[PDB]
Design a binder for this molecule. Sequence first.
Ligand SMILES: [Cu+]
Ligand SMILES: [Cu+]
Ligand SMILES: [Cu+]
Lengths: 273, 79
Amino acid sequence: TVRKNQATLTADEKRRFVAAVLELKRSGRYDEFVRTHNEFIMSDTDSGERTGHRSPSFLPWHRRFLLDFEQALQSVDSSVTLPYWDWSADRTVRASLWAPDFLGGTGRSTDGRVMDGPFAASTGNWPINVRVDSRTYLRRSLGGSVAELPTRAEVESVLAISAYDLPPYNSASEGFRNHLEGWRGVNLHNRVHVWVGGQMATGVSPNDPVFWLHHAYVDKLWAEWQRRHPDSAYVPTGGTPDVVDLNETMKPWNTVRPADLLDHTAYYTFDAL
Amino acid sequence: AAPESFDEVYKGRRIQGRPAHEHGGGYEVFVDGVQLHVMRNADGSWISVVSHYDPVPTPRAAARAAVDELQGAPLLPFP
Ligand SMILES: [Cu+]
Ligand SMILES: [Cu+]
Ligand SMILES: [Cu+]
């Protein structure tokens, strides 16, 4: 129930994490997470209903999605928790994240195919099934489509924004949520997707297990923001068309509200916050 | 007020756009005759399902970005 920085995992932790992810893939459960995510990324729109993305609920929706995934991992190996990837610190292809004992590295230049680590197509253990094209292998181009990951300075500038979110509660908004998501400003979360490349740059981005570590760190930064701004909280707080208000339930679960997800400590803590 | 239609061969592939599981979709894009999911952001930029975190100014730019992403691969029809 402690989420740790990936860079600190022990050998046994890396091994049990990899094995639990590979077993969810084998059993077919993994791909339904990919499919769920792609349906929301394709349906959430700036002028209409928006729940998982480009909206205030981006943060509690991904918090609950990651909890669903972590619980599924724990059903395979109850010792496993989601690690997080602090991409402001671990910002090169030589980060141990990308070593063959963890997520494997970048893809080759010819077709972007990942050639090492447990998720390489050659293993036979990571078919890409839920996809938008004929390619069935994990792809990445670390640092190919954008030169640099966000820096700590840039992260700090976003953490300093006091308002959680602002009308019109979409990709055009000012405030914390949209600057963290990245549609405005220096760009944190979106730019990391673009920096990894391959399936992480697409609507079927959970095909890459780094998805979970990226979102675990985005989730950490929300928790950091709450600490800096104890007088700020989720908005909107009632009656907003197309947007999940604080006490409204969210799809697909329908049984949980942003209000139920504001305090992460009800589900996990961090190694250091 | 939708962008104009277009039709060209980009890096050997035919890309088309026209004004018209997912959303509304007031504009359609195709790569070699397969529909590509695209979306318009509030600021007027566009993205597609194969480049969803990387806004480009126009639907033709999104189609070209998809051809770049696909590296020759056929597109599968969306949902
Ligand atoms: Cu997402
Ligand atoms: Cu979309
Ligand atoms: Cu994301």
